[PDB]
Structures are given as C-alpha cells and as structure tokens.
Write a protein that binds this ligand. Structure first.
Ligand SMILES: [Fe+3]
Ligand SMILES: [Fe+3]
Ligand SMILES: [Fe+3]
Ligand SMILES: [Fe+3]
Ligand SMILES: [Fe+3]
Ligand SMILES: [Fe+3]
Lengths: 156, 158, 156, 156, 158, 155
C-alpha cells in the first residue's frame, strides 16, 4: 500500500494545484475586465484549497504520512485569449481532479481500505456536481460568445 | 519599470511560500499531537494566503502583470524534532517575509511609486506585530520546554 | 512653495474633474443614457468632495488656497457615442492621477511628511478609480459592437 | 433665444454662488471662525444642488445646456472682517434674486408656463435666503461694535 | 542606527513632557477658576500620555530599546498670568511636538525605516489637527479677552 | 509642612506611575505580556491617584508645583520577574510611608479635611501591599521550576 500513501499525497497536491490554476483564471479574468467571472474563480480557488486541507486533516488522523510537494506554476494562462479558452482549461482541470480522485478510490478499493472509501464518498459526489456546473457554464459562454459583446452580459 | 514589477510579482510568491510553510508546521504539530499549536499554524497559513491575494488584487488594479510561480515544497519539516525547532523556523520565515517587504518598499521608493508605498504601509506594521508575536511565543516555548511535559501542558491551555 | 502651488492646483484639478463629470452626465441624459448619467453625476459629487478634503487640510495646515476659475468643459462638443464620453473620462482620471503624483513628488522633495501621509488614501483611491473606469470603457467598447446591446445594459 | 440664454446664465450663477460661498468658508476657516465657515460650506453645497436642479430640468425639457466657466471668487482678496464677508454674501444673494427674476421675465414673455411653474419654489426660497442673510448681517454688524463679542457668538 | 533609536526615545519623553505641561495648564486654569479650560487641558494631558504609550508599545514590538527618562517639571506656569499666556505656551508646546515628530521621521527616512514611517503617519496627521485647533482657540481667546469679563463666557460654555 | 508634603505626595504618585511603566516595559521586552498588562494598568491607576491629589489641592487652595518625575532606575538591574516584583513591593511600601507621613503632618495640624481625604488611600494602600506581596510570593514559588512561571503568565 505504498501505492495508496502515494496516491493520497498526489491528491493533496492535485487539490492545491487546482487551487492555483483557479487563481490564475481569476487573474486573467480580472486583468481583462471580467470581474464576475474572476469572482467566481477566486471562490473556487479557496474551495479547492479547503479540499486539500480536508485530505491533510484526514491523513493526519489516519497516520497517512503526508509530505507537501511543490505546487507547480499554472501554465495555461499564457495561452488564454478569451473567456472561452479559460473555461475550457478549467473544465479540463476538473476532469483531471475527477481522475485523480478515481485513481485514489481504485487504490483504496484494492486495499480494502473502507475508511478511505467512506471518506472519499462526498468528494466523488461533489466532483459530479463540479464537472456538470463547469461544463454547463462553458456551454453558455460558447453560445453567448457567438455575438460580439453579448458575453459581457453574462459577466452579471 | 522592471525591478519594481518583478519584486511585486515575487512578493506574491513569498506570501504563498509562507502559507505553505505554516501549513507544513501545522501538519508536524498535528502528527505529533500538538493540536493547539497546529490550529495556530493553520490559521496563519490562511492569513498568509489572504495577504498574497491582497497583493494579487492590487496588482490587477494597478496593471502590474502577475505571473504565478511554483510554490516550493517546504523543507524544514524533515528536520524538525521538537516544537522549538518548528517555532524557530517560523521566526526565520517571518524575518524573511519582513525583508522581502522592505526590499519591495525600497524599490517602490527608488521608483517614486507612491501608490505602492501607500499600499505597503499596513503590511509593514503587520510584520512588526507578527515578528513580535512569533518571537514571544518562541521565548515561551523555549522556557517551558525546560521541564519535561510542561510545554504540553500549555498547548492544552492557550 | 512649489509645494504650495501644486497643492492649489490639485484643488483646481478636483473641481475641474467634478465639472467634466457633470458635462458627461448631461451628454448621457440628453441622449437617453440615464444609468450612465446617474453614474457620472455620482462621480461629479465625489470629485467635489475630494476638492473639499484638500481645501480643509490646506486651511488646517496654513497652506493658503486661492480658488481658480473652473474652466468650461469642452470634450462634450466632440462626444457622439458613449464610448467617446468614457474615453474622455479615463483620460480625466489619468490626469487626476498625474496631478496627485506631481503633488506627492513636491511633498517628497520638501520632506513634507504630513502632506505625504494625507495623500496616501488618495493614492490608493486613484488606483481603484483608474481600474474602474478602464474596466467600464472595456465593457462599453465590447458591447457597442452589436447595435442596441449597450443600451440594454445601460438599463442596469 | 433669450430664454435659452438666460436659463444657461442661471446655472452658471448657481455654480458661481456655490464657489463664492466656498471662498467665504475658506476665509472664515483661515481666520478661525469655524461656526461661520460651516454655515458658508453648507450654503455652498445647497447652491450647487440648485444648479443641478436647473440642469436636470433643462435636460428633461430639451433646453440645451453648455456649462460655462465658474470664475475665481476674488472678493476674498479684500475681506478683512466677518462683516466684509457677510456683506459680499448679501450682494451675491441679491444677484441670485436678479438672475432668477430675469429668467422668470423671459419665461413670462415666451408664455413658458412649465418654466414658470418650475421657478416658483426658487422665487420663494430666494425670499427666505435674502431675509436670512440680511438678518445675520444685521446681527454681525451690531455685535462687532464690542471687541471680541462677535467671536463669542460664532459658538453658533 | 543610534540616532533613530535615540530620537525614538526622545519622542517618548516629549509625549510625557507635553502630558505634564497640559497638566500644569489645567492646574493654573483650575486655581484661577476657569474650569472649562481646565477640563480641556486635563483631557489633552491624558491624550499625550496615550501617545507616549503608543510609542512605547511600538518600540517594544520592534525591539527598539526604550529607557524612560525623567519627565521634566513644567516651567511656564510660574509666569502665566492670563488665559492668553497659557494657550500661547500650549501652542508652542504643540509646535515642538510637531518638530519633534518631523525630526524622528527625517531620521527614519535616512535609515529607510519604512515600518517607523508607516507608524508615524497618523501622528503627523494628528499634529496637523492639534496645531490648528490650539491656534484657533488662541485666536478666540485673544479676541474675546479684549472686553473685560467676556472671555469668562468662552469658558462657562466650552 | 503639610503643604510641602502634599506637593510631594503628587510627585510620589507620578514617580510610582513611571516605575510601574518601567516594569511593563521590562516584562514586555522579555515576553511576559500578562505581567506587562498588569503593570501598565497599575501605572494608569497611580497617575489617577496623583490627579485626585492635585484636584483636592486645587479645591483646598494648597499650591501645587509639579516637580520633575525621576527616571526609573531599577530596570537596569532586573534580570528576572522576581526582581521586578520585589522592586514594585518596595515601591508600594514607599507609597504607604509617604501617605502615612502626609497623614502625620495633617494630624499635627488638626487638618480634618486632609485626614478625611486620605482615609480611602490608606485602605487602598493596605489592599495594594497585600496584592503585590501576594503576587511576589506566587512568583518566587513558581520560579523554582524552570518554565513554570511562564506557564502562569498566561493568566
Ligand atoms: Fe477539489
Ligand atoms: Fe505575509
Ligand atoms: Fe479626485
Ligand atoms: Fe440658489
Ligand atoms: Fe502627542
Ligand atoms: Fe498611589
């Protein structure tokens, strides 16, 4: 179950990585005068970090040794040119978050780690909601952005 | 101009670095059953991150380009043996945080960037308070750790 | 001295800005942009309040104030769409930031610590103000690309 | 059009009176009459609200407004006691009354019944204003016959 | 640097000194039956002392060694013979209080001590208000004392 | 002289106020924030007593000449909280002696109003000496085990 301790560490790292990527997206939104979209990303940034803290807290309680990895620089921001690009990368991030949680659940299942499985249950359910929501926002952005100016309306 | 813009950008990295080292301390304290000290380190971790977000927000408004950098793996944790070690690393962290702010203020000064200097003032004053507070806690920790079990007795209280 | 002269000029620049905001509110009102008009009117009162704050401080610090003419606004003659108005307003705020920086430079030269402390919150407020007008202008320029679309968001 | 011209001259007069009242507050403040300074300051704000009321009316009624320069108040350079200040203020109010009566006369000639209705409460207000200033000026010139006594009454 | 540290110490002494000078002014007013003026001075004395305490507390946080000096006796009371003399000495005390702070800021500036500069900003602004308020009371006093007994109205009011 | 001693009681109160302030400074610089807050509160209170004496002297036409308030000097030689508390006990004993000498001079002059004014200060000095005495005893007891006194500064 090195594989398990490992994946559990990778999950913590994925949560903080995703928090930074959300922060990068709020920065791009802000810089380009989409304050509504920026507020939304900033709030998701804080939430991803809360998920990381929740995994750490659980690992401490269960004596899963956690060691903090570097949180890499978000990369996609240098390539974003419009809100559509940003929301697409955020959907890909969320798909990565889902995979990372499934990888861990798979390893827990193999080890018969029932406590880890019970712990992950609300995060599986949260990811379903998260993916659906981002996917749904991206569809609106992509439909609205077909008329010059109209997406500025969505920005609330 | 280059210097100021780079340093401002780097100040955000230093805020998030400090956030992660606070978090690593919390995990050490937790793993070693110092839950009072862990909760304190945890709250400081949130607070450092809020400072880095205030620098980001100001940079956005002032058109200072921000490029978010890697937040490095905290390293002091592999070598911590006792609460005193962790608090001493936290003191060094705050002293570093103060130095990075004074450097930034030094560049803002050279550049005559009055806005950045105004923005920095409450951070300077906050750093004075933070160093004092951590210095004080370390002195308390080092004094109580002289009698076996006594320091534990304070984690439980305050 | 040079510091007295500039302190006076800042007063004049605040009252000039207050009138330029009023001129913008009139153009928007006459062209049926009531929400943009209400916004300019609000800014006009607030520039005047800054003017009064400088005067109050100068009287306390024995800096003599000579009230200058507030010149007739002249951009309204060229405005023909909301984008032209907002562009003139961003240039007004850039000039406000400049008048304030010149005053700060002279206070710094004379080592006038109390003047510098007084200007700090105005420094920070000018950051917010430039950002905010820049952002509305970017939004206006984007929405204006579809006929009627700007109008529908003046109703907001 | 006499009417349009005069309606514009009325706005300028309101904003001019606002600036003159401000000049008077400065003189009072500089000379440590904080009670009188606060009174002149409140009156400065009210005069500007009147000018805003005429501008708003003018916009609704399609009276084109071009905002003219607000001249530097210059009386301040020769004021040397509160009596001089209050006397200039009375003179300012008598000029406010004349411009309003001039405007009403042109409205009347043009049979402009909407303008006439709009002017009624300003005619009544000017009545109250001249009475009030004339009455303060009588108190000030009576109390100033005893050294220090006027001061004792700036404790408003 | 020694000079900043020394001026910081002298700033504390200047605040306590002004506190005692205000107290001397309330005593003279009270002895001569100007209880309104006496209450004003007494409020100002507690306030100056609060300033000295704020300076002490900042110095402690920032490890600026403080050594309390003697608070010298007020000297001007022996020569006051009317409220005008008192308010005039009080305006002079506040002019010195402002010079004293300006000197300290100049030394902080030379040293690039941005934390000290940030800490002094509200004291620079408070001195502006204090010198204007005292200057205006002095003007009112010297005007009203032109008519025998009239000044005795200022008092039995403010 | 009653008048001379009355004037000197003012100086003693403000002297005590400053020594208490010197003691908060030492505790604060040495990270005893609990003891520092207590000293600071006692500093304010000693100054209030001095103000009460001045106010009574003004009412009773006792001329008040404010004297120099001397520099506290025990701070030079404090190296533990026990030293600081020992100096404060001596300060309060001094405060008590100067009130008794003032009372003695009032008694000799049959100054009944001064004696009546002093009564609550005599009772307050009894409480003060007891409380400081009692703190010094707790401090000297707890300081026999390394770090233990620190643990109770948090109180
Ligand atoms: Fe997550
Ligand atoms: Fe920080
Ligand atoms: Fe402004
Ligand atoms: Fe009017
Ligand atoms: Fe002060
Ligand atoms: Fe006492």
């Amino acid at each position: 179950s090195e594989e398990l301790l490992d994946l559990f560490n990778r999950q913590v790292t994925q949560e903080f990585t995703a928090s930074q990527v959300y922060l990068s997206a709020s920065i791009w939104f802000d810089q380009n005068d989409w304050e509504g979209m920026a507020a939304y990303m900033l709030a998701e940034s804080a939430e991803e970090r809360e998920h990381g803290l929740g995994f750490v807290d659980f690992a401490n309680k269960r004596n899963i040794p956690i060691e903090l990895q570097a949180v890499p620089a978000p990369v996609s921001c240098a390539e974003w040119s419009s809100p559509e690009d940003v929301w697409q990368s955020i959907l890909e991030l969320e798909q990565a978050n889902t995979r990372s949680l499934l990888n861990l659940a798979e390893a827990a299942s193999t080890c018969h780690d029932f406590a880890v499985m019970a712990f992950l249950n609300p995060f599986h359910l949260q990811q379903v909601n998260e993916e659906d929501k981002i996917g749904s926002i991206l569809a609106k952005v992509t439909d609205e952005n077909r008329t010059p100016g109209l997406l500025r309306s969505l920005d609330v």
